[PDB]
Design a protein around this ligand. Structure first.
Ligand SMILES: NC(=O)C1=CN([C@@H]2O[C@H](COP(=O)(O)OP(=O)(O)OC[C@H]3O[C@@H](n4cnc5c(N)ncnc54)[C@H](O)[C@@H]3O)[C@@H](O)[C@H]2O)C=CC1
Ligand SMILES: Cc1cc2nc3c(=O)[nH]c(=O)nc-3n(C[C@H](O)[C@H](O)[C@H](O)COP(=O)(O)O)c2cc1C
Ligand code: SF4
Ligand code: FES
Lengths: 430, 85, 213
């Protein structure tokens, strides 16, 4: 296939994405969920890991690590310690609200994904670290887990396979940094959500000291559909090394902000004008698109005309795919006010552990707050660039990178607008 | 640790007393500020024996190599878990 | 907004806090979710339970969570001051949380923040004199396609106009509890002018299942 997009409704993983069907167990089993789960479990860990490696599933959390390669880090003998699958249901990214829709509307798909994935990785239980702000979704998920226990689908002799597997839900308490997998581990362990250093990776030392795989809600929930439909079905969508389907959250300055499941390498312009009704005021009213939530660099209108919405074509467009959360910004936007608000978010959501983020993200927020007013000089733009290059790569987790990249995208694509802002400040205040 | 690299020869501290006029530290010891620097211990011993100085040597106290592990802060069953970070 | 504690007469280690016995059974069920020997992993739920029984956290809820989990009290103080939900001051009975990040600021959450301010007569951080409404300004609540939106105590009120949040505040003052949903026409997250996808009926069990399973 050469052009991508226009996904059919029969080829959807997240049926009942919109809350239009029964999310409970009798509705979920009537939509293909929990069907032949025992036959998936009995074929061993190696078969399930091979079906995930065949499918080409990458990490839907946003970094895009190969999911089968990541989950095969647990295919190793027991050293006395138990093993844990941990579902990352935090979703603190601005723009991103897809995991809320999975937990709220397809919860049994997440529970079956916990069972199948923890069977693949030999795990003992599933700790679903859900966001603390998602209370109704957490009780929603707990109702589904009660329905899964009472049907014998999980717990003692899960689905009649002789495999014991629990599913726990831990609520967060209001920290974006607790979506980072090691800080999420530290938050489950009852401490401040500060990220660990790597190595040890969580497959070696994870939650409680155990072998542990943290994986996103989407990359876990699509795994029983990969096991039932086959890995080649999932690899038959999107470009090569960009396989599958993907949830997209188009918000901001579009006519109909919405969540949509779409084929992987869909064009951005087609996605916006097909599922969201296009940019408000027309496509010529488009100023910028933050393609994948707040951490990715923005791209202007001259990149959004031709770009594909997968990992590799956005890396080649000097941005990232991230969480596939499309924030659309029209010509009426003070883009410096939006990016400075985004940097303000990253200094409010920063755990204070290491030096470059703790100091430099606040220092970038002060510089961006002066750039909104134009209370600066153009030699501070390049300086700000250097500050971002001192935060990027030198921090413990990638929130320093995710704070550096909006600054770098704004400078790289809108340096003249910053310079005219500052020179008009200078000529109206002197 | 750059000040712990070379051997040093000092002398026994003699009396310091108070100046009656100003309150300064008066001394009568000519060798009170004499600190000599040597690459090895035996050069220092040879320079002391060459000058007729009764010496005493303290051996170099080197720090022993510790076993450092970051994941040991997050153990399953050991007491070396950190309670915070 | 501070991160050191000073003993007021209403916030001290002699302030009366204690769990109800049904909350003690809830704490037992919480601590049974974690391995034997990692009871400190129950700091974040139980302390949040102390915020649900009491409304806020004095420094007797923190010391009680420290005592019943056999953890040092500083390890509960760190959790209480790290995570933004734990109210270390008493808030109003309805805790209005306006999201003002970029996907909601682009869809005019400023007008709704102004509407709540000019309605309640307060500003951000202040509590109304009847102690019913506390207005603060929070980061991304994770409902970005339903922007603009607020959170009140469990609930997301989404796709709001200033009239809609005025009406929600009017019926919160009247005692009723509103419906946590988008105040526009749509239901959860669909496109607002009809479904662009998932119009066909879902297939059901057995569809597309590979051979050898
Ligand atoms: N979904 C959301 O709400 C948010 C998502 N993000 C995304 O998070 C991304 C950053 O995530 P990170 O995990 O920090 O990036 P990445 O460097 O670490 O790693 C991604 C995954 O691969 C695994 N991995 C990579 N190399 C490995 C190795 N050698 N051995 C074992 N495991 C290995 C890691 O355990 C991790 O789970 C950003 O690009 C952003 O798009 C950021 C903020 C919020
Ligand atoms: C600051 C920060 C916040 C993150 N928040 C989340 C999150 O909320 N949800 C998520 O699934 N991944 C989040 N991630 C990505 C995780 O580190 C991790 O890659 C992912 O949760 C699990 O891997 P996966 O993508 O294969 O599922 C975050 C990363 C960083 C650096
Ligand atoms: S860079 Fe920021 S988010 Fe990461 S460990 Fe340091 S303080 Fe935490
Ligand atoms: S930006 Fe307001 S909910 Fe995500």
């Amino acid at each position: 296939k050469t052009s991508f997009g226009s996904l059919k409704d029969e080829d959807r993983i997240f049926t009942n994405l919109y809350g239009r069907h029964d999310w409970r167990l009798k509705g979920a089993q009537s939509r293909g969920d929990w069907y032949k789960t025992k036959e998936i479990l009995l074929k061993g860990p190696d078969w399930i890991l091979g079906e995930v490696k065949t499918s080409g599933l990458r990490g839907r959390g946003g970094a895009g690590f190969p999911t089968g390669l990541k989950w095969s880090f647990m295919n190793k003998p027991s050293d006395g310690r138990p093993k844990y699958l941990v579902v990352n249901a935090d979703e603190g990214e601005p723009g991103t609200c897809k995991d809320r829709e999975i937990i709220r509307h397809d919860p049994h798909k997440l529970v079956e994904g916990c069972l199948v994935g923890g069977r693949a990785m030999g795990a003992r239980a599933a700790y679903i670290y859900i966001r603390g702000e998602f209370y109704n979704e957490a009780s929603n998920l707990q109702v589904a887990i009660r329905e899964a226990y009472e049907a014998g689908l999980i717990g003692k002799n899960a689905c009649g396979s002789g495999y014991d597997f629990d599913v726990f839900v831990v609520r967060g308490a209001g920290a974006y940094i607790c979506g980072e997998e090691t800080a999420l581990i530290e938050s489950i362990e009852g401490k401040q959500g500060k990220p660990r250093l790597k190595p040890p990776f969580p497959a070696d030392v994870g939650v409680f000291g155990c072998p542990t795989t943290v994986a996103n809600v989407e990359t876990v929930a699509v795994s029983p559909t990969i096991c039932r439909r086959g890995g080649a079905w999932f690899a038959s969508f999107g470009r090569e090394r960009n396989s599958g389907t993907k949830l997209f959250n188009i918000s901001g300055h579009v006519n109909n902000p919405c969540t949509v499941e779409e084929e992987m390498s869909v064009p951005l312009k087609e996605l916006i004008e097909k599922h969201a009704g296009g940019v408000t005021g027309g496509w010529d009213n488009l100023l910028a698109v933050i393609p994948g939530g707040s951490s990715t660099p923005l791209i202007p209108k001259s990149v959004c005309e031709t770009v594909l919405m997968d990992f590799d074509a956005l890396i080649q467009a000097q941005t990232g795919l991230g969480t596939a959360a499309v924030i659309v910004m029209d010509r009426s936007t003070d883009i410096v006010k939006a990016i400075a608000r985004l940097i303000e978010f990253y200094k409010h959501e920063s755990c204070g552990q290491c030096t470059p983020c703790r100091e430099g993200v606040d220092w970038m927020n002060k510089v961006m707050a002066r750039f909104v007013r134009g209370d600066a000089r153009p030699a501070e733009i390049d300086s700000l660039w250097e500050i971002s290059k001192q935060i990027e790569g030198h921090t413990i987790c990638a929130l320093g990178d995710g704070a550096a990249w909006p600054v770098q995208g704004l400078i790289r694509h809108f340096r003249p607008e910053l310079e005219e802002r500052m020179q008009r400040f200078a000529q109206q205040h002197q | 640790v750059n000040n712990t690299k070379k051997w040093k020869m000092e002398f026994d501290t003699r009396e310091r007393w108070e100046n009656p006029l100003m309150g300064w530290a008066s001394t009568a010891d000519p060798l009170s500020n004499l600190v000599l620097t040597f690459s090895t211990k035996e050069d220092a011993i040879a320079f002391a024996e060459k000058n007729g100085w009764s010496y005493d040597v303290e051996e170099r106290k080197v720090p022993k190599p510790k076993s450092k592990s970051y994941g040991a802060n997050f153990s399953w069953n050991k007491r070396t878990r950190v309670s915070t970070k | 907004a501070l991160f050191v504690h000073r003993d007021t007469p209403k916030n001290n280690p002699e302030t009366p806090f204690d769990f109800t016995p049904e909350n003690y059974k809830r704490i037992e069920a919480i601590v049974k979710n974690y391995p034997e020997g990692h009871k400190a992993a129950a700091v974040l739920p139980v302390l949040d339970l102390a915020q649900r029984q009491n409304g806020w956290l004095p420094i007797s809820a923190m010391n009680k969570v420290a005592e019943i989990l056999q953890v040092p009290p500083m390890r509960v103080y760190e959790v209480a001051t790290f995570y933004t939900m734990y109210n270390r001051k008493p808030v109003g009975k309805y805790h209005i949380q306006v999201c003002t990040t970029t996907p909601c600021m682009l869809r005019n959450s400023d007008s709704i923040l102004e509407a709540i301010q000019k309605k309640l007569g307060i500003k951000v951080g202040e509590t109304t004199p009847d102690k019913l409404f506390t207005l603060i300004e929070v980061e991304c609540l994770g409902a970005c396609v339903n922007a603009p939106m607020v959170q009140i105590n469990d609930n997301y009120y989404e796709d709001l106009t200033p009239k809609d949040i005025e009406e929600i505040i009017d019926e919160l003052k009247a005692g009723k509890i509103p419906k946590p949903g988008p105040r526009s026409g749509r239901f959860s997250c669909e496109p607002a002018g009809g479904l662009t996808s998932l119009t066909e009926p879902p297939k059901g069990p057995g569809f597309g299942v590979q051979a050898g399973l």
